[PDB]
Amino acid sequence: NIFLNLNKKSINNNHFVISIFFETIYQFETKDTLLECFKNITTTGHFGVIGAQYEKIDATRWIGDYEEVNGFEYIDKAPSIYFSVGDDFNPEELIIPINLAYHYFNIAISDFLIAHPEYQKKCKEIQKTYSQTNC
Amino acid sequence: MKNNIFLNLNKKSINNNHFVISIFFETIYQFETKDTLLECFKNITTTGHFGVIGAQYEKIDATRWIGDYEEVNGFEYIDKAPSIYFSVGDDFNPEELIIPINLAYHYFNIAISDFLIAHPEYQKKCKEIQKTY
Numbered sequence: 421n422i423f424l425n426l427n428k429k430s431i432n433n434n435h436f437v438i439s440i441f442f443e444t445i446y447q448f449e450t451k452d453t454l455l456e457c458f459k460n461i462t463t464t465g466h467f468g469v470i471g472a473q474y475e476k477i478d479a480t481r482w483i484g485d486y487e488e489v490n491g492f493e494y495i496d497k498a499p500s501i502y503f504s505v506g507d508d509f510n511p512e513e514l515i516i517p518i519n520l521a522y523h524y525f526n527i528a529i530s531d532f533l534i535a536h537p538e539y540q541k542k543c544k545e546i547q548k549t550y551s552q553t554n555c
Numbered sequence: 556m557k558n559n560i561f562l563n564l565n566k567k568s569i570n571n572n573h574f575v576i577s578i579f580f581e582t583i584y585q586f587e588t589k590d591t592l593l594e595c596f597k598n599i600t601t602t603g604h605f606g607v608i609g610a611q612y613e614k615i616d617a618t619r620w621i622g623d624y625e626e627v628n629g630f631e632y633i634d635k636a637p638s639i640y641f642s643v644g645d646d647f648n649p650e651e652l653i654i655p656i657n658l659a660y661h662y663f664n665i666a667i668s669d670f671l672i673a674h675p676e677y678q679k680k681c682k683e684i685q686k687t688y
């Protein structure tokens with residue numbers, strides 16, 4: 421597993437959905453797709469493949485179908501984001517604050533560029549966007 | 556959510572770069588009942604397999620086809636020692652790990668300790684299972 425620092429932090433935070441999200445996209449999708457996954461959090465706020473997705477939560481719209489998800493309580497407190505992995509019918513779900521999501525994404529893209537130095541320039545550009553966007 | 560109980564397991568699995576083991580236990584503890592987790596602990600030394608949505612293990616039968624394990628981290632253990640397969644996520648695209656059964660017992664011994672420490676009502680059942688490891 422190349423996600424050494426991501427896994428350590430996410431597992432220690434009981435956010436195993438994040439661990440699964442990155443590993444399964446990395447192993448199955450192309451590296452170009454993974455780069456888009458890293459980027460979309462700053463732009464559209466959503467990304468989805470078979471068995472893995474995230475979506476920033478629009479708190480001006482209905483949140484009733486998040487009530488049973490781990491992390492539901494974050495929505496009322498701060499801008500939050502929904503992650504899921506696995507089957508569409510029985511997904512493994514997690515909600516976390518967007519700030520924490522950016523923390524994870526910055527760690528994950530670091531793991532990736534460290535393991536795949538050919539992607540140094542592109543990953544640093546995306547990290548720059550994280551720093552611009554996220555206080 | 557349910558707070559993480561796998562304090563000692565997580566230290567060891569992370570140290571060993573066996574993240575799937577911690578994901579496996581965190582998944583079962585979060586999504587399933589404590590009685591189900593107990594059966595997870597028990598089955599490794601009885602039937603040799605256990606599965607829920609998002610987490611499973613199966614002892615590897617090295618007398619049967621192992622071609623589908625070829626790309627899994629830990630595949631090389633199969634020819635060296637009795638081994639066991641773990642996966643987390645969904646079978647469309649699961650996150651997979653193979654380790655020797657002796658190491659799996661080592662992890663389960665730590666995990667079941669975390670469990671009984673957090674949930675002392677299960678003291679006796681856990682101690683009995685631990686003896687088998």
Ligand SMILES: [Br-]
Pocket residue numbers: 428429432
């Ligand atoms: Br940590």
Ligand SMILES: [Br-]
Pocket residue numbers: 434435436437438513514
């Ligand atoms: Br999680």
Ligand SMILES: [Br-]
Pocket residue numbers: 449450451452
């Ligand atoms: Br690729």
Ligand SMILES: [Br-]
Pocket residue numbers: 466467468
């Ligand atoms: Br998308």
Ligand SMILES: [Br-]
Pocket residue numbers: 529530
């Ligand atoms: Br970095």
Ligand SMILES: [Br-]
Pocket residue numbers: 428432565566569570
């Ligand atoms: Br640690």
Ligand SMILES: [Br-]
Pocket residue numbers: 421572573574575576651652
């Ligand atoms: Br792993």
Ligand SMILES: [Br-]
Pocket residue numbers: 587588589590
């Ligand atoms: Br329970």
Ligand SMILES: [Br-]
Pocket residue numbers: 622
């Ligand atoms: Br073959």
Ligand SMILES: [Br-]
Pocket residue numbers: 627628629630631632
């Ligand atoms: Br291997």
Ligand SMILES: [Br-]
Pocket residue numbers: 630631632633634635
């Ligand atoms: Br082998």
Ligand SMILES: [Br-]
Pocket residue numbers: 667668
């Ligand atoms: Br103990």
